[PDB]
Structure formats: structure tokens, C-alpha cells
């Protein structure tokens, strides 16, 4: 049974809420995919998760407790304020915004208007639809924000509509990277 | 758990046999960098980032070194409970709207990976490609499995087939995930 | 220079 593989995982997490004014530190010791031990800056100590971590529990606490508790400050708080502020929490990527009509046009005929908002960062954004400068609220839907994996996100928002003479629909995008909203029109 | 931001500063993954290891830094789900254990070098996904912050690979090495250690004290303590293969799930989507002739990137997302060992490749017209293709490290999941993305730059064509070949032990046959413009 | 969480050893 050589095809009998193995693996352990060490997964640290620094949860930041409102700057560093509030941090929760979590350390997960994993075997294959079972979590057997863990540290929680909220529980205040190491605790055995499964039966497997029953051994380590006492040894990890007696030894590394004070050292692990401190990481909330030496790793978490420190990194956030020293490395994150000038990189992550400063990256602002304006999105591209296009509008494509779902089916072929046809006056007075049920159709959709898709607004593609791609390549932006961070994720928090807001896309609106307007019809003759009057906001369309009914028949507006969207996809699940997509994490492209290359430090950018994308999303598509639909507007079921009915193309009529002289109508000008508008996609409205507001983002932390925009001094003012990006507005794209679609003319009937 | 909830918060405005999350940072995994030092995710270690030691896999035996093969002494296969990964060491990464993750922030809000994206990948900052990984320590190339062979070159003893810190590989940043974003260039402009390494010009404002840095990390010493030795830290990677030291912790990987501990992964090796612990993955043994455990592999034994668990009476050797081998790990359980899973079946990965691929999903192919564009990066931006596919305009004909207009450059673009094909993104293949693969979730539910376990263990983190896998071959992802592209195929243009059932024929394979190996170029202009790049992939991310193994991102962790809440259920302790992983996911990874592979990228294939290309030019939108009204006569081009594409596939995301995904090979993994927990997959009898290499799964393919079609896509067309 | 950023730091990292120490993957403690066992036994």
C-alpha cells in the first residue's frame, strides 16, 4: 500500500476588525484534514480539538502559551500595521465596465442588459442601473462576486428591461478606487 | 469567524512520503507569496509588493522543517491513519468579456483538492498547451481541503475549443472541463 | 520585514 499518502497542516489566522482595535488569533494544527489542536486568543490557551490532540494539549500550554499569546501583537498586529497598510490595504484597482444586450434588439421586446464589472480591488463595490436617469430597482440581479485569484474581483449585474424609442439605460459603478462613479450608457 | 480582514501568516503543508512542502502567506483570501523551498526564495504574486515589504525564506524553511518533524509524531500517533483521497471540482470562466481577437485570460478554478497534489493543464482544440499558462499555490479552505487556479492567456476565437485537464489520485480518469466563446 | 506564526513542534 505505497499509495498511502500523508500530510499535516499548520494554519494561522489573524482576524482584524476595525483596524487593529480588535484582533482574534487562531492557530490550527492539522493532520491530513482533521484539526486536532488549536489556539484561540479568545479562549486564551491551547485546547485539544479531537482525541489526537489530547497528548500535545498540556505540553504546548506549559511550553509555548506565553509565546503564542504574544503573536497577537508580534505577528498579527505588527504585520497589519507594518506590511499590510502600505500594500494590501492600499491596493485600489479601478474596474472595467461594459454593457452587452442579452438577445438581439427589438423595440418593445423583453430583453436583458448585462453590465460587466471586472478586474477590481478590493471586493466591496456597488453597481446600479438607471433608465432615463431614473434608477431601476425591479428586475435587477447579479452574479456571485468572483475572486479571479490574481488579486482582483469581477461581477456581472443584469437588468431585465424593455427597449423603447429614445431610452438611455445606465450602469452606475461606485468603488473606493473612484473619485467619481464610472457611468456607462446603452442606447436603444 | 468574522472580521474586516484575515491574514494567515505562515501556512505550512508537509506531505509524506515525498517530503512535499508548501509555505505561504495569505491575506483576505488572496496569495501574497510562497517560499520557493528549492531556491530558498520568497515568491511574491504581486511584484510591486516586494518593493515595499519582505519576508526571510529561512522562516519558511524553519517551519517546513517543523512540518517534517510533526508529520511523523502524528503519522504515528494516529496509528498511521492514511489520508483520504477526494475528488476535485473544476470551473472555467473568463477574466474579462471575451471580445474576438481581443486578448484575454482563461481562468480555471479547481476546488476541493485533497491531498494538495494535482496536475492542471490546458487544451486548445483537444490538443494541449503548456505555454502562457500559470498557476497559484494551494489556497486553504474552511473544511481543510484546498483549491488552486491555473491561467491560460489567449486570443478569443470563433473557432477555438478549450479544456482544463485535471489529474488527481481521487480521480479515476483525468477530468476535463470544456469552454467555448 | 514581516514576521510569521511559529509552527510549534511536538512530543
Amino acid at each position, epitope marked *: 500500500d505505497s499509495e498511502r499518502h500523508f500530510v499535516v497542516q499548520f494554519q494561522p489566522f489573524c482576524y482584524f476588525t476595525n483596524g487593529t482595535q480588535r484582533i482574534r488569533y487562531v492557530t490550527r494544527y492539522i493532520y491530513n484534514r482533521e484539526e486536532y489542536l488549536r489556539f484561540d486568543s479568545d479562549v486564551g490557551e491551547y485546547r485539544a480539538v479531537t482525541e489526537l490532540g489530547r497528548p500535545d494539549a498540556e505540553y504546548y500550554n506549559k511550553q*509555548y502559551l506565553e*509565546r503564542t499569546r504574544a503573536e497577537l501583537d508580534t505577528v498579527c498586529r505588527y504585520n497589519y500595521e507594518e506590511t499590510e497598510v502600505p500594500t494590501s490595504l492600499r491596493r485600489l484597482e479601478q474596474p472595467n465596465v461594459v454593457i452587452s444586450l442579452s438577445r438581439t434588439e427589438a423595440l418593445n421586446h423583453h430583453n436583458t442588459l448585462v453590465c460587466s464589472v471586472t478586474d477590481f480591488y478590493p471586493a466591496k463595490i456597488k453597481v446600479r442601473w438607471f433608465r432615463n436617469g431614473q434608477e431601476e430597482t425591479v428586475g435587477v440581479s447579479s452574479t456571485q462576486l468572483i475572486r479571479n485569484g490574481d488579486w482582483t474581483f469581477q461581477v456581472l449585474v443584469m437588468l431585465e428591461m424593455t427597449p423603447r424609442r429614445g431610452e438611455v439605460y445606465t450602469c452606475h459603478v461606485e468603488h473606493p478606487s473612484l473619485k467619481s462613479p464610472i457611468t456607462v450608457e446603452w442606447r436603444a | 469567524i468574522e472580521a474586516d480582514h484575515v491574514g494567515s501568516y*505562515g501556512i505550512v503543508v508537509y506531505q509524506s512520503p515525498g517530503d512535499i512542502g508548501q509555505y505561504t502567506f495569505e491575506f483576505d483570501g488572496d496569495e501574497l507569496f510562497y517560499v520557493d523551498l528549492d531556491k530558498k526564495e520568497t515568491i511574491w504574486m504581486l511584484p510591486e509588493f516586494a518593493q515595499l515589504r519582505s519576508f*526571510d525564506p529561512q522562516g519558511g524553511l524553519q517551519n517546513i522543517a517543523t512540518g517534517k*518533524h510533526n508529520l511523523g509524531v502524528l503519522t504515528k500517533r494516529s496509528n498511521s491513519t492514511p489520508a483520504t483521497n477526494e475528488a476535485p471540482q473544476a470551473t472555467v470562466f473568463p477574466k474579462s468579456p471575451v471580445l474576438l481577437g481581443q486578448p484575454n485570460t482563461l481562468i480555471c478554478f479547481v476546488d476541493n483538492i485533497f491531498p494538495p497534489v494535482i496536475n492542471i493543464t490546458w487544451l486548445r482544440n483537444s490538443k494541449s498547451v503548456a505555454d502562457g499558462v500559470y498557476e497559484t499555490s494551494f489556497f486553504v479552505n474552511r473544511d481543510y481541503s484546498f483549491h488552486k487556479l491555473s491561467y491560460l492567456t489567449f486570443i478569443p476565437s470563433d473557432d477555438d475549443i478549450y479544456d482544463c485537464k485535471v489529474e488527481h489520485w481521487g480521480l479515476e480518469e483525468p477530468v476535463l472541463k470544456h469552454w467555448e466563446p | 520585514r514581516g514576521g510569521a506564526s*511559529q509552527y510549534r513542534p511536538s512530543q
Partner: T-cell receptor, first 112, second 111 residues
Framework: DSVTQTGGQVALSEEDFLTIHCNYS??????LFWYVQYPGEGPQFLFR?????EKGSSRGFEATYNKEATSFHLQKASVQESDSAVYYC????????????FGAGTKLQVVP | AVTQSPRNKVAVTGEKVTLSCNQT?????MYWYRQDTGHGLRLIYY???????EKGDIPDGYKASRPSQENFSLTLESATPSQTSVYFC????????????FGAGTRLSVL
């Protein structure tokens, strides 16, 4: 990184008050310690301190992590003739390196 | 504990010298320091485990090997007078700022 510490040699009488200065110059958030090198032996751990304001102690010796003045000054009640040894101040970064940097050391001579 | 060998080495310029260190602490970390006046301890080499050779702060003129767990050796290819000093070996469990355990040293002089 560097750990700069009090001169080279100091001399005290028994019962005197010990104070050995140590300032450090680090890039991250380092752990600080003190080791002792008794005559004819190798250095040895005394106590550590992982974060600002934390105090470390051992065998009557103590030092408080002061991030503000980047100091980790060693202090003791009243020294004893057997305290004569070389005191090393040191640090380790928060990078996981496991690299322990040291200072020049300070020779302490407690007169009988 | 930790033990070194030899505990006194008189050597000649050019000669190839080697120091040996053993430990029953079972730590995965082992280091090679040298003590000089005005310099204190300075790290030359250390290892994260068997097969590990990490260059410390003052590597030049040195080489090392961690053939197993309990043994880490340092080698001066072409010994020189500037390499005259007391060498101390140490082991650590690799637990963030791992406290270090030192051997009694090896007094070496290059005439």
C-alpha cells in the same frame, strides 16, 4: 540587527545593586533574553521576554521589555560573589529564523 | 546535554581543522557560534535538521554538516590566525526564539 550593551567590565561589592544596560536595534518585533557565562562553562539561558512591557526574571535577575527606549536592562537585588560572570544580552526576530543574535557581553566582578 | 570535541585545539596556519558536537537534547536545531572579545558570540553556521546547512552571520572560511540529528560539525578548510577563538555549539527545539543550550566550548588557536 544589533544588541549594544554596557561597556566591557564592571566591578561591584557584595550586596550592591546590579544594573547591566542593553539596547537593541531591530527591524521587526523581537524576543529579548539574557544568558550567563559562568567561569569555565558555556553560556546559558536566564529568562526571555516576548512583548513590550513584559518582564522576565530568574534567580533574582530581572529585565523589562521596553519597546519605547528599545531597552532590556538587567537588574538584580544585591549581587553575591558567585554572581561574577559574563552577561550576554540577546534577541531573536519574529521571522521564525530561529536565529539568536547576541551582544558583546559584559564582565561582572563582585568583590569578596 | 551537549558535548564538543576537542576541548583544546592548537593548530597551524593552513591546516584543515574540524570541530564535532553531539547532543542528547533531541532538538532539531543546532548552531555554531564563536566568542571573541568586543564581539561576544557571533553565529557562523546552524541547521534546521539532518541535511541542513544554513549560513549564519560570519560564514566565510567555514563549512558544516548535520549528518544526523545529534551531530553537527564545523570545518575550517584552511585554518588561519584570525580564526583563533573559543567556539561554542548549541541546540534548540525550534520553538520561536527557542532557548539555546550551549556546550563548554573549544578553545582554538592558530599559530
Amino acid at each position: 540587527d544589533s544588541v549594544t550593551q554596557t561597556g566591557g567590565q564592571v566591578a561591584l561589592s557584595e550586596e550592591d545593586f546590579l544594573t547591566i544596560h542593553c539596547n537593541y536595534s531591530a527591524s521587526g518585533y523581537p524576543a529579548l533574553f539574557w544568558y550567563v557565562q559562568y567561569p569555565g562553562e558555556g553560556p546559558q539561558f536566564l529568562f526571555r521576554a516576548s512583548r513590550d512591557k513584559e518582564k522576565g526574571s530568574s534567580r533574582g535577575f530581572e529585565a523589562t521589555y521596553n519597546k519605547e527606549a528599545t531597552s532590556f536592562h538587567l537588574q538584580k537585588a544585591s549581587v553575591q560573589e558567585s554572581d561574577s560572570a559574563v552577561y550576554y544580552c540577546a534577541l531573536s526576530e519574529n521571522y521564525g529564523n530561529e536565529k539568536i543574535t547576541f551582544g558583546a557581553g559584559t564582565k561582572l566582578q563582585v568583590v569578596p | 546535554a551537549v558535548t564538543q570535541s576537542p576541548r583544546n585545539k592548537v593548530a597551524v596556519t593552513g591546516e584543515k581543522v574540524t570541530l564535532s558536537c553531539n547532543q542528547t537534547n533531541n532538538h532539531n536545531n543546532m548552531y555554531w557560534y564563536r566568542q571573541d572579545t568586543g564581539h561576544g558570540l557571533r553565529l557562523i553556521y546552524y541547521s534546521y535538521g539532518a541535511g541542513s546547512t544554513e549560513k549564519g552571520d560570519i560564514p566565510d572560511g567555514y563549512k558544516a554538516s548535520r549528518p544526523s540529528q545529534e551531530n553537527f560539525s564545523l570545518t575550517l578548510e584552511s585554518a588561519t590566525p584570525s580564526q583563533t577563538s573559543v567556539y561554542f555549539c548549541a541546540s534548540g527545539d525550534a520553538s520561536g526564539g527557542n532557548t539555546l543550550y550551549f556546550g563548554a566550548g573549544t578553545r582554538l588557536s592558530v599559530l
